[PDB]
Amino acid sequence: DLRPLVPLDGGRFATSDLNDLYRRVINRNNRLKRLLDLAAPDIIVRNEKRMLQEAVDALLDNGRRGRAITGSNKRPLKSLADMIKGKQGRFRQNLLGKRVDYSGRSVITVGPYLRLHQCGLPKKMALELFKPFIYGKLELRGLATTIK
Amino acid sequence: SDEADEAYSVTEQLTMTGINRIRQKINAHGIPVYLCEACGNPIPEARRKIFPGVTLCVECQAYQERQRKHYA
Amino acid sequence: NIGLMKAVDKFEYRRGYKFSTYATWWIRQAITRSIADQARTIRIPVHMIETINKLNRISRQMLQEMGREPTPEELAERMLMPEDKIRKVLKIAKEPISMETPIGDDEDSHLGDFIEDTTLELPLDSATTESLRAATHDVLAGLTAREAKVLRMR
Amino acid sequence: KAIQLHPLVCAAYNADFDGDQMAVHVPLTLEAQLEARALMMSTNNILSPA
Amino acid sequence: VYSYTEKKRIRKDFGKRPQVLDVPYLLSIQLDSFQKFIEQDPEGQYGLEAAFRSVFPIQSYSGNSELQYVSYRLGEPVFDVQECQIRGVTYSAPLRVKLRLVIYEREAPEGTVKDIKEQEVYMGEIPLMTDNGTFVINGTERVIVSQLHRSPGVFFDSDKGKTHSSGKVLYNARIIPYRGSWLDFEFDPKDNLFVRIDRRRKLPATIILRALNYTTEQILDLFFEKVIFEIRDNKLQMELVPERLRGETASFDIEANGKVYVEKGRRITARHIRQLEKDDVKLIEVPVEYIAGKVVAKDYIDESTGELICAANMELSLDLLAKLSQSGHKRIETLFTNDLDHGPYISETLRVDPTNDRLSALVEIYRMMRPGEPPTREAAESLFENLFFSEDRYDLSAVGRMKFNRSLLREEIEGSGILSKDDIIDVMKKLIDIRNGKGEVDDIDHLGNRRIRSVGEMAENQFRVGLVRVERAVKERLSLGDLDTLMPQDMINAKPISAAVKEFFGSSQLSQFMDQNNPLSEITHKRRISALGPGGLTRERAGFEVRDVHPTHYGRVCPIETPEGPNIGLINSLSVYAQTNEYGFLETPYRKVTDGVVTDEIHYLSAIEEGNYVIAQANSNLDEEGHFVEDLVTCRSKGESSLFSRDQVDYMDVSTQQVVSVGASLIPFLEHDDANRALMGANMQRQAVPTLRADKPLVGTGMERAVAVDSGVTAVAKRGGVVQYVDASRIVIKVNEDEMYPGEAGIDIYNLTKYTRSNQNTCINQMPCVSLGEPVERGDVLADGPSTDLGELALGQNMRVAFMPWNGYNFEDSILVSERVVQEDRFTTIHIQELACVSRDTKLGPEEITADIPNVGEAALSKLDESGIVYIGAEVTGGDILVGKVTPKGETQLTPEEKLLRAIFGEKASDVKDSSLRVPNGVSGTVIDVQVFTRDGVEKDKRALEIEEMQLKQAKKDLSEELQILEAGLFSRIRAVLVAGGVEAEKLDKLPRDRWLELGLTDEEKQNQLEQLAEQYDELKHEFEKKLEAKRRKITQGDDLAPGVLKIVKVYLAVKRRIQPGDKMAGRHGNKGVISKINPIEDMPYDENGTPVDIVLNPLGVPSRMNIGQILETHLGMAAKGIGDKINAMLKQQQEVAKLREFIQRAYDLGADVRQKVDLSTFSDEEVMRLAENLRKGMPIATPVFDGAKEAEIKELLKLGDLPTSGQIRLYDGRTGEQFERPVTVGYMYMLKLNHLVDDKMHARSTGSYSLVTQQPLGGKAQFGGQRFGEMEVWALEAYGAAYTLQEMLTVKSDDVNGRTKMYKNIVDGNHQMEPGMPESFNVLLKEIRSLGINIELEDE
Amino acid sequence: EIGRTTDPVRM
Amino acid sequence: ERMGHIELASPTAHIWFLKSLPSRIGLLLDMPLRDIERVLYFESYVVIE
Amino acid sequence: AGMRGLMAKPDGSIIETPITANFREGLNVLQYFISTHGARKGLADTALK
Ligand SMILES: [Mg+2]
Ligand SMILES: [Zn+2]
Phi, psi of E619 (to 5 degrees): -85, 55
Which residues have a Cβ under 8 Å from the Cβ of D1 and sit 6 or more positions away? A106, A107, A122, A124, A125, E1060, E1061, E1062, E1238, E1239, E1242
G22 prior amide bond cis, ω within 30:
yes
User: CA-to-CA distance for E675 and B60, rounded, in angstroms?
Assistant: 42
Cβ count near G20 (within 10 Å): 13
Q: What is the DSSP letter of E246?
A: T
CA distance G46 to chain A (A): 15
Phi, psi of E705 (to 5 degrees): -65, -45
Answer for the pair H19, H32: CB distance below 8 angstroms, yes or no.
Answer: no
Answer for the pair E721, E746: CB distance below 8 angstroms, yes or no.
Answer: yes
Cβ count near E48 (within 10 Å): 22
Question: What value, to the nearest 5°, has the Cα angle with vertex E1077 and ends E1074 and E1082?
Answer: 135
Phi, psi of E333 (to 5 degrees): -95, 125
Phi, psi of E1037 (to 5 degrees): -70, -20
User: CA-to-CA distance for E460 and E479, rounded, in angstroms?
Assistant: 28
Nearest CA in chain E to H14: E640
Q: D18: annotated binding-site residue? A: yes
| Ligand nearest, relative to CA of residue B63 | 2
Which residues have a Cβ under 8 Å from the Cβ of E479 and sit 6 or more positions away? E60, E61, E62, E63
Q: E438 CA to middle of ligand 2, Å?
A: 24
- Contact (CB<8Å) B19/H8: yes
Phi, psi of E174 (to 5 degrees): -140, 140
The alpha carbon torsion through E72, E77, E78, E82 (nearest 10 deg) reads 170
Quick one: which of C4, G13, E379, E371 has its CA closest to F11? Answer: E371
Answer for the pair E244, E336: CB distance below 8 angstroms, yes or no.
Answer: yes
Quick one: which of E755, E754, E753, E735 has its CA closest to E745? Answer: E735
User: Is the sign of the CA dihedral A42, A48, A54, A57 positive or negative?
Assistant: negative
Cβ count near E1078 (within 10 Å): 16
- Contact (CB<8Å) A52/G19: no
Q: What is the DSSP letter of C111?
A: G
User: CA-to-CA distance for A78 and A60, rounded, in angstroms?
Assistant: 10
User: CA-to-CA distance for A104 and A81, rounded, in angstroms?
Assistant: 34
User: CA-to-CA distance for E1019 and E1021, rounded, in angstroms?
Assistant: 5
**E727 SS3 class:** coil
**E1089 SS3 class:** coil
Which residues have a Cβ under 8 Å from the Cβ of E409 and sit 6 or more positions away? E430
Answer for the pair E93, E125: CB distance below 8 angstroms, yes or no.
Answer: yes
> Which residues of chain F neighbour A66 with C-beta distances below 8 Å?
6-7
User: Is the sign of the CA dihedral E1241, E1247, E1248, E1250 positive or negative?
Assistant: positive
B30 prior amide bond cis, ω within 30:
yes
Quick one: which of E100, E102, E93, E118 has its CA closest to E40? Answer: E93
Q: D16: annotated binding-site residue? A: yes
- Contact (CB<8Å) G16/E1332: yes
Question: How far is Cα of residue E776 from the mean position of the Cα atoms in its chain?
Answer: 34
Quick one: which of D6, D19, D15 has its CA closest to D45? Answer: D6
Reported resolution, Å: 3.7
Amino acid at E436: N
Answer for the pair E1299, E1317: CB distance below 8 angstroms, yes or no.
Answer: yes
C108 touches A at CB < 8 Å: yes
Residue E1116 parent element (H or E): helix E1109-1132
The end-to-end CA distance of chain H, in Å, is: 31
User: Is the sign of the CA dihedral E1240, E1242, E1245, E1246 positive or negative?
Assistant: negative
Number of domains in chain B: 1
User: CA-to-CA distance for E35 and E27, rounded, in angstroms?
Assistant: 12
User: CA-to-CA distance for F7 and G11, rounded, in angstroms?
Assistant: 20
DSSP string, E614-664: -B--SS--B-SSS-BSSSEEEEBSSSS-EEEEGGG--EEES-GGGGS-TTT
Instruction: Determine the length of chain B.
Output: 72
Nearest CA in chain G to A61: G15
Answer for the pair E513, E141: CB distance below 8 angstroms, yes or no.
Answer: yes
DSSP-H helix ranges across E28-88 = 28-38, 47-55, 81-83
Quick one: which of E928, E919, E922 has its CA closest to E832? Answer: E928
* CATH level 3 topology of E831-947+1043-1055: OB fold (Dihydrolipoamide Acetyltransferase, E2P) (2.40.50)
Which residues have a Cβ under 8 Å from the Cβ of E1332 and sit 6 or more positions away? A60, A80, A81, G14, G16
Sheet holding E141-144, edge to edge: E135-136, E141-144, E511-513
User: CA-to-CA distance for H4 and E236, rounded, in angstroms?
Assistant: 69
DSSP string, E429-470: HHHHHHHSSS-----SSSTTSEEE--HHHHHHHHHHHHHHHH
Q: What is the DSSP letter of E493?
A: -
- Contact (CB<8Å) A139/E1308: yes
Cβ count near E665 (within 10 Å): 27
User: CA-to-CA distance for E517 and A121, rounded, in angstroms?
Assistant: 31
**A146 SS3 class:** coil
Instruction: Determine the length of chain A.
Output: 148
Question: What value, to the nearest 5°, has the Cα angle with vertex E454 and ends E449 and E456?
Answer: 130
Tell me the three-class secondary structure of B7-72, residue by residue.
HHHHHHHHHHHHHHHHHHHCCCCCCCCCCCCCCCCCCCHHHHHHCCCCCCCHHHHHHHHHHHCCCC
Which residues have a Cβ under 8 Å from the Cβ of C148 and sit 6 or more positions away? C140, C141
**C90 SS3 class:** helix
- Contact (CB<8Å) H28/E569: no
Answer for the pair G18, G41: CB distance below 8 angstroms, yes or no.
Answer: no
DSSP string, E1047-1070: EEEEEEEE------TT-B-B-SSS
Chain breaks in chain B (C to N over 2.5 A) after: none
User: CA-to-CA distance for E1122 and E1129, rounded, in angstroms?
Assistant: 10
Distances (CA, A) of E48 to E34, E55, E102, E456: 11, 11, 22, 9
Q: E1247 CA to middle of ligand 1, Å?
A: 29
> Are β-strands E797-803 and E254-256 bridged in parallel, bridged antiparallel, or unpaired?
unpaired
Which residues have a Cβ under 8 Å from the Cβ of H25 and sit 6 or more positions away? none
Q: Which of A14, A23, A27 sits opposite C111 (nearest CB)?
A: A14
* E957 backbone φψ class: left, alpha, beta (φ>0; ψ -120 to 50): alpha
Q: Which of A33, A46, A60 sits opposite G16 (nearest CB)?
A: A60
Distances (CA, A) of E1318 to C31, E805, E1248, E1299: 49, 53, 20, 9
Q: D30: annotated binding-site residue? A: no
**E150 SS3 class:** strand
Amino acid at E574: L
The alpha carbon torsion through B31, B37, B43, B45 (nearest 10 deg) reads 0
Question: What value, to the nearest 5°, has the Cα angle with vertex E857 and ends E854 and E858?
Answer: 120
DSSP string, E883-909: E--EEE-----PPTTHHHHHHHH----
Quick one: which of E73, E38, E39, E44 has its CA closest to E56? Answer: E44
DSSP-H helix ranges across chain G = 16-19, 24-28, 33-40
User: Is the sign of the CA dihedral A88, A92, A98, A99 positive or negative?
Assistant: negative
G37 touches F at CB < 8 Å: yes
Long-range pairs, E407-414, Cβ under 8 A, ≥24: E407/E153, E407/E154, E407/E155, E407/E156, E407/E442, E408/E154
User: CA-to-CA distance for E1316 and E1302, rounded, in angstroms?
Assistant: 9
DSSP string, E1175-1222: TTT---EE--SSS---HHHHHHHHHHTTS-TTSEE--B-TTT--BPSS
Quick one: which of E1294, E1298, E1297 has its CA closest to E1256? Answer: E1294
User: CA-to-CA distance for E1277 and E639, rounded, in angstroms?
Assistant: 53
Tell me the three-class secondary structure of E971-984, residue by residue.
HHHHHHHCCCCCCC
User: CA-to-CA distance for E419 and E424, rounded, in angstroms?
Assistant: 8
Q: B59 CA to middle of ligand 2, Å?
A: 5
> Are β-strands E1095-1097 and E815-818 bridged in parallel, bridged antiparallel, or unpaired?
antiparallel
Quick one: which of E1067, E1213, E1084 has its CA closest to E818? Answer: E1084
User: CA-to-CA distance for A69 and A54, rounded, in angstroms?
Assistant: 10
CA distance E252 to chain B (A): 26
User: CA-to-CA distance for E163 and E169, rounded, in angstroms?
Assistant: 9
Count Cβ atoms within 10 A of the Cβ of residue E110 and give its class: 0-12 exposed, 13-18 middle, 19 or more buried.
Answer: exposed
The end-to-end CA distance of chain G, in Å, is: 43
C18 touches E at CB < 8 Å: no
Quick one: which of G15, G12, G26 has its CA closest to A60? Answer: G15
Question: What value, to the nearest 5°, has the Cα angle with vertex E45 and ends E41 and E50?
Answer: 85
User: CA-to-CA distance for E1106 and E1295, rounded, in angstroms?
Assistant: 49
Count Cβ atoms within 10 A of the Cβ of residue B66 and give its class: 0-12 exposed, 13-18 middle, 19 or more buried.
Answer: exposed
C128 touches A at CB < 8 Å: yes
User: CA-to-CA distance for C108 and A94, rounded, in angstroms?
Assistant: 14
Helix axes C145-153, C123-141, angle to 10 degrees: 140
Answer for the pair D35, E829: CB distance below 8 angstroms, yes or no.
Answer: no
Nearest CA in chain A to F9: A47
Q: A15 CA to middle of ligand 1, Å?
A: 39
- Contact (CB<8Å) H40/E569: yes
User: Is the sign of the CA dihedral C127, C129, C130, C134 positive or negative?
Assistant: positive
DSSP-H helix ranges across D1-50 = 10-13, 30-35
Quick one: which of E315, E226, E269 has its CA closest to E254? Answer: E269
* E1044 backbone φψ class: left, alpha, beta (φ>0; ψ -120 to 50): left
Quick one: which of E1117, E1178, E1110, E1233 has its CA closest to E786? Answer: E1233
User: Is the sign of the CA dihedral E896, E897, E901, E904 positive or negative?
Assistant: positive
Asked how this structure was determined, the answer is cryo-EM
Residue E1142 parent element (H or E): helix E1137-1147
Cβ count near E1176 (within 10 Å): 16
**DSSP-assigned beta bridge partners for residue E58:** E67
Distances (CA, A) of B11 to B8, D22, E170, H17, H44: 5, 30, 30, 17, 10
CA distance E676 to chain B (A): 6
- Contact (CB<8Å) C101/A73: yes
Give the residue numbers spanning the domain of B22: 1-72
User: CA-to-CA distance for E183 and E419, rounded, in angstroms?
Assistant: 11
Distances (CA, A) of E1298 to A91, C127, E663, E1293: 22, 13, 55, 10
Chains in contact with D via at least 3 Cβ–Cβ pairs below 8 Å: A, B, E
CA distance B9 to chain E (A): 11
User: CA-to-CA distance for E1123 and E1149, rounded, in angstroms?
Assistant: 13
Query: Buried b / exposed e across E412-444, counting CB within 10 Å, b at 16+?
Result: eeebbbbbeeebbbbbbebbbebbbeebeeeeb
User: CA-to-CA distance for E826 and E20, rounded, in angstroms?
Assistant: 38
Query: Buried b / exposed e across A90-104, counting CB within 10 Å, b at 16+?
Result: beebbbebbbbbbbb
Cβ count near E154 (within 10 Å): 25
User: CA-to-CA distance for A52 and A59, rounded, in angstroms?
Assistant: 10
Nearest CA in chain F to G43: F11
Residue E184 parent element (H or E): strand E184-187
**DSSP-assigned beta bridge partners for residue E1339:** none
Residue A57 parent element (H or E): helix A42-60
User: CA-to-CA distance for E146 and E526, rounded, in angstroms?
Assistant: 8
Answer for the pair E568, H40: CB distance below 8 angstroms, yes or no.
Answer: yes
- Contact (CB<8Å) E1186/H35: no
Chains in contact with C via at least 3 Cβ–Cβ pairs below 8 Å: A, E
User: CA-to-CA distance for D28 and H17, rounded, in angstroms?
Assistant: 64
Cβ count near C17 (within 10 Å): 11
Nearest CA in chain D to B1: D16
